């Protein structure tokens, strides 16, 4: 099966899915390899080819440091790249239903990874089930991460910042110019992403250069107003200079610094990335989105507050235990191999790990609002409090605040609270419904009966897949046929949200109200 794209023909491959067929084009290039003098620059247009490009395997993932904290453990290594790392990584993937659709809605996945890691080839991002089950086209792309994607000298085109966001954007541009050749409808494109991918999706809502490249947006556990999502001008400068010094590229002409960094092997850049910050945390984003004056014209909190974003529908949600995954990457007393009962003193120590630059008073204020218990004799009180601190501050409260502020400008928004813990979750039970572990349900992995998911999980994934496809196609994430709970729009007044679980799917109001008032109204002052 051959498709003629604007830059040349590509050959895909047939996939057997659920007694049917999906056509996969894995690894289509969408930009000139950003090598040599193109390292740190915006992605350049692709020179046409006349051959038949073989898009029959995932391409290189972008250079990145690997999570080595739990070698051999599926819970962590399932997020590590599964193809060769290379600077030659600007490729995308296309899953089209078979028989070829005539005008299918397109879903474009943007992976997360703290803007430092990630790849579109992960097993949990496999789009073949969505193409099979919902007859949508699924697209995903690799975009540059870390310093190679987000090194910033604002205004300098040799390293302007936000290159990995421009990679994503050039990929959306490719879909606009090419997806009709695949049976896709360029006028019906939904972006969806998780974590940094969701923060990226929300930044495309703000970026005028992306306005015309998609229709709607889904944001899973992330948004640009999360405290880790946007690097300020002061930090980005200090971090660029610190990388220069660590590598021996300190110059006075900033363009000469970039030339010097261009001769460094990718590995040398990657090993010094960790140390450009004096006090890191498990949530550090050393090199991420910045206000560059190109992709992002102003501080995005101002743009959100003042209604300067694409007017469209959004689907936003978070997981019940967003915070716990980060606790075993540094908080004292925590371990994935025991139940991590921690003491008051260990809790206080954990706050220093997660809020290193925060004053004594600020850390006391966190402790005060999170450690007023009903039964102060529950041994896991402090363990659960620290997970909630990290999850509320980094994910849940920013997602709610984004959704309130976005919906105040007239658009339908839908908010979900995902609270099913996967029966196949390799992490221990105390970590709960972890960050990232809704993704496999969104992509329909539990629809594969040959896997070890329960029947309740197949049904839950089936409903979520239908709701996501209905949102993409029609702007309304309902399941209209199986007597499902109707999903009400989220309004800034009543703030209704839908819970997603195997048992009872419920309409609730004002998620984490007391906690988010602390983080959203108080904590920014300290
Ligand atoms: C494919 O369908 C589009 C319409 O898509 C719908 O409308 C969009 C605005 C958006 O809401 C999507 O989610 C919907 O699915 C057809 O678009 C028409 O195209 C012609 C020619 O370009 C144009 O004159 C009309 O104005 C378009 N109608 C619109 C914009 O509403 C398009 O023709 C279909 N293409 C194929 C090949 O089937
Ligand atoms: C801005 O950067 C300076 C320099 O960072 C140091 O050098 C880098 C190459 C890298 O190795 C970092 O880990 C180093 O810390 C920071 O100043 C340092 O701050 C720490 C702790 O605050 C202190 O112990 C060091 O002695 C400082 N070194 C110097 C030369 O001042 C500074 O903190 C950074 N600013 C911010 C806001 O983070
Ligand atoms: C849970 O485990 C942590 C981490 O300890 C490591 O992993 C364990 C599963 C086990 O294999 C240990 O050998 C490892 O050290 C425990 O925290 C440690 O506690 C010891 C007590 O001797 C202390 O000296 C260390 O500093 C701690 N390690 C840290 C803070 O990283 C914790 O006590 C265990 N909790 C429970 C309830 O079993
Ligand atoms: C460092 C570190 C360890 N973490 C702990 C948990 C785990 C989170 N995963 C894995 C992918 O699950 C979606 C990330 O990729 C990741 C890494 C850093 C982030 C920084 C800010 C916001 C989100 C982040 C997400 C990796
Ligand atoms: C690109 O692929 C071409 C065809 O691939 C081969 O033939 C098809 C029908 C399948 O059987 C497939 O698995 C086979 O590999 C090759 O002829 C051609 O050389 C390839 N181009 C390369 C490798 O640069
Ligand atoms: C820095 O170097 C560049 C490239 O060689 C040059 O164009 C630019 O003018 C230089 N700037 C200064 C201040 O010397
Ligand atoms: C609705 O229920 C039937 C079983 O009665 C099932 O086959 C079908 O796929 C369900 N659809 C969705 C979208 O959940
Ligand atoms: Cl308060």
- For this structure, the quaternary state is monomer
Number of helices: 16
Which percent range fits the helix content? 25-40%
Largest sheet: 11 strands, mixed
- Here the CATH topology equals Rossmann fold
Topology, number of strands: 16
Please compute the radius of gyration using only Cα atoms. 22 Å
User: Kindly, what is the distance between the CA atoms of the first and last residues, rounded to a whole number of angstroms?
Assistant: 59 Å
The total tally of domains equals 1
Superfamily (CATH H level) name = Alpha/Beta hydrolase fold, catalytic domain
Instruction: Assign the CATH class.
Output: Alpha Beta
The secondary-structure class comes to alpha/beta
PDB class: hydrolase
Keywords: Butyrylcholinesterase, inhibitor, complex
Assembly: monomeric
Entry title: Recombinant human butyrylcholinesterase in complex with N-(2-methoxyethyl)-N-{[1-(prop-2-yn-1-yl)pyrrolidin-3-yl]methyl}naphthalene-2-carboxamide
């Amino acid at each position: 099966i051959i498709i003629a794209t604007k830059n040349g023909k590509v050959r895909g491959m047939q996939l057997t899915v659920f007694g049917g067929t999906v056509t996969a084009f894995l690894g289509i290039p969408y930009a000139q390899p950003p090598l040599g003098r193109l390292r740190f620059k915006k992605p350049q247009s692709l020179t046409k080819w006349s051959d038949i490009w073989n898009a029959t395997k995932y391409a290189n993932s972008c250079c990145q440091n690997i999570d080595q904290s739990f070698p051999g453990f599926h819970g962590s290594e399932m997020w590590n790249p599964n193809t060769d790392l290379s600077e030659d990584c600007l490729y995308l993937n296309v899953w089209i239903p078979a028989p070829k659709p005539k005008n299918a809605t397109v879903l474009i996945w943007i992976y997360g990874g703290g803007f430092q890691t990630g790849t579109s080839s992960l097993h949990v991002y496999d789009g073949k089930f969505l193409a099979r089950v919902e007859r949508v086209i699924v697209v995903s792309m690799n975009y540059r991460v870390g310093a190679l994607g987000f090194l910033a000298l604002p205004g300098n085109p040799e390293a302007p910042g936000n290159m990995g966001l421009f990679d994503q954007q050039l990929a959306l541009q490719w879909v606009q110019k090419n997806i009709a050749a695949f049976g896709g409808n360029p006028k019906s494109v939904t972006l969806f992403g998780e974590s940094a991918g969701a923060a990226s999706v929300s930044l495309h809502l703000l970026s005028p250069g992306s306005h015309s490249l998609f229709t709607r947006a889904i944001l899973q556990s992330g948004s640009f107003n999360a405290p880790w999502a946007v690097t300020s001008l002061y930090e980005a400068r200090n971090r660029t200079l610190n990388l220069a010094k660590l590598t021996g590229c300190s110059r006075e002409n900033e363009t000469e610094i970039i030339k010097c960094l261009r001769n460094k092997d990718p590995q040398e850049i990657l090993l010094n990335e960790a140390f450009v910050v004096p006090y890191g945390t498990p949530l550090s984003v050393n090199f991420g989105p910045t206000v560059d004056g190109d992709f992002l014209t102003d501080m995005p909190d101002i743009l959100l507050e003042l209604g300067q974003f694409k007017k469209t529908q959004i689907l936003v949600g978070v997981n019940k235990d967003e915070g716990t995954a980060f606790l075993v990457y540094g908080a004292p007393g925590f371990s994935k191999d025991n139940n991590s009962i921690i003491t008051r003193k260990e809790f206080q120590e954990g706050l220093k790990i997660f809020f290193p630059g925060v004053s004594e008073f600020g850390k006391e204020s966190i402790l005060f609002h999170y450690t007023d218990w009903v039964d102060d004799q529950r041994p896991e009180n402090y363990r659960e409090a620290l997970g909630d601190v990290v999850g509320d501050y980094n994910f849940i409260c920013p997602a709610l605040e984004f959704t309130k502020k976005f919906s105040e400008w007239g658009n339908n928004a839908f908010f979900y609270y995902f609270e099913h813990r996967s029966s196949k979750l390799p992490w221990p039970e105390w970590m709960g419904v972890m960050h990232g572990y809704e993704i496999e349900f969104v992509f329909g992995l539990p629809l594969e009966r040959r896997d070890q998911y329960t029947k309740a999980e197949e049904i839950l994934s089936r409903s979520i897949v239908k709701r996501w496809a209905n949102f993409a196609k029609y702007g309304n994430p309902q399941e209209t046929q199986n007597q499902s709970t109707s999903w009400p729009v989220f309004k800034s007044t009543e703030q209704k949200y839908l819970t997603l679980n195997t048992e009872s799917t419920r309409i609730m109001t004002k998620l984490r109200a007391q906690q988010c008032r602390f983080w959203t109204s108080f904590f920014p002052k300290v």
